[PDB]
């Protein structure tokens, strides 16, 4: 593994477009702090710190919309899109003025800073910036 | 290509080539006519166009088109020319400017006179 983070969100993304009830990602504090976010923003139901063969995982409990009417029943997605921005190849770091503004509001972009793993709305109100971790809508 | 590769190799800026080298960057150039004959054009056209091979003051010799019907140009005509290839003609990459130097305008020209070097009919 080279990017635990990308792996994670990409565990979500991979699992949601096949509508898994949950998905387990290998564990880290930093990963939880971000998961804490997805939930707290209504992207996932939630998560817990379970176990497989004695290796700390987190189960993530996914979330969708209703079945829909038509030839495609499949529910619209809650997390529509979620891609890494800062990266081990290319670090991305924004200032507070520089802080991007997702989907004209309706999406977010979680970002590590020296005052927690906030969100874009948060960082603007908490007046800081940092490594733009990803973006979700 | 990865981001390291562009840190490393960079990207190559595009280099455009001139299609009027013999101008030496000038808007126009003057020349003396070394040869005035006609030439035939390629498939699918068929005609006898009026070219002039011209010695430039950049010291290029080039061969130029003569626009219009009928010219008064010939060996030793001091002429002035401009960028502009002629598609049907191999190796023509300039035109003569009509109504300049020894280049006459065109007799009985009424529409688009300016492009044929032709004063206004009273």
């Amino acid at each position: 593994l080279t990017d635990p983070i990308a792996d994670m969100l990409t565990r979500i993304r991979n699992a949601t477009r096949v509508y898994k009830e949950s998905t387990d990602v290998p564990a880290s504090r930093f990963k939880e702090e971000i998961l804490r976010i997805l939930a707290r923003e209504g992207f996932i139901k939630g998560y817990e710190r379970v176990d497989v063969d004695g290796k700390p995982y987190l189960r993530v409990y996914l979330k969708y919309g209703p079945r829909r009417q038509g030839p495609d029943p499949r529910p619209e997605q809650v997390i529509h899109h979620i891609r890494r921005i800062s990266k081990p190849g290319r670090r991305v770091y924004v200032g507070v003025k520089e802080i991007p503004r997702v989907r004209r509001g309706l999406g977010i972009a979680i970002l590590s800073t020296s005052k927690g793993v906030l969100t874009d709305r948060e960082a603007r109100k908490l007046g800081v910036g940092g490594e733009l971790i990803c973006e979700v809508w | 290509p990865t981001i390291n590769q562009l840190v490393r190799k960079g990207r190559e800026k595009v280099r455009k080539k001139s299609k009027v080298p013999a101008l030496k960057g000038a808007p126009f150039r003057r020349g003396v006519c070394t040869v005035v004959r006609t030439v035939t054009p390629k498939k699918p056209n068929s005609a006898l166009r009026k070219v002039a091979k011209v010695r430039l003051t950049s010291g290029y010799e080039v061969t130029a088109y003569i626009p219009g019907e009928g010219h008064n140009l010939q060996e030793h005509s001091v002429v002035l020319i401009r960028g502009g290839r002629v598609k049907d003609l191999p190796g023509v990459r300039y035109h003569i400017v009509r109504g300049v130097y020894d280049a006459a305008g065109v007799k009985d020209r009424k529409k688009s006179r300016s492009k044929y070097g032709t004063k206004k009919p009273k």
């Binding site: - | 003396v32 006519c33 070394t34 010695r55 010939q74 060996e75 030793h76 001091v78 020894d102």
Partner: protein, 138 residues
């Protein structure tokens, strides 16, 4: 076309004299002009843009063909006698319909002589001259 007339001279025996004006019906010399040539009218800017009576008479009497030897320096001559033709307006350059040689024509032997002799000993020209070629037929 419009031209500046900076100063006006007058040629004496042993000196030039500067003047401020030349009245009608008098000759002198002007410095300043650039596009001007012999046989041309010249008027004050806001005047009847008239052209003086040109001149006009004799057509050249003697004809001599000139061969640009070799050959990328034919046109040393091409720009040579265009400088010449506004310097002497009595010779006449022409190129032959058939045969394609260059045919300077003149007011007499003597006239062609110096014009030719100049063309070489003043313009180097790699060239020789003589009897024009004849356009034959079957």
């Amino acid at each position: 076309r419009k031209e500046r007339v900076a100063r006006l001279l007058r040629m004496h025996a042993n000196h030039r004299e500067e003047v401020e004006e030349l009245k009608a019906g008098d000759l002198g010399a002007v410095v300043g002009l650039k596009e001007t040539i012999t046989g041309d009218t010249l008027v004050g800017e806001d005047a009847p843009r008239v052209i003086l009576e040109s001149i006009e008479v004799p057509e050249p009497v003697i004809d001599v063909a000139i061969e640009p030897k070799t050959k990328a320096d034919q046109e040393k001559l091409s720009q040579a006698l265009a400088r010449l033709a506004e310097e002497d307006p009595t010779f006449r350059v022409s190129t032959h319909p058939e045969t394609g040689q260059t045919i300077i024509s003149g007011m007499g032997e003597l006239h062609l002589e110096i014009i030719v002799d100049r063309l070489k000993r003043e313009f180097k020209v790699d060239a020789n001259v003589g009897k024009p070629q004849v356009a034959y037929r079957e």
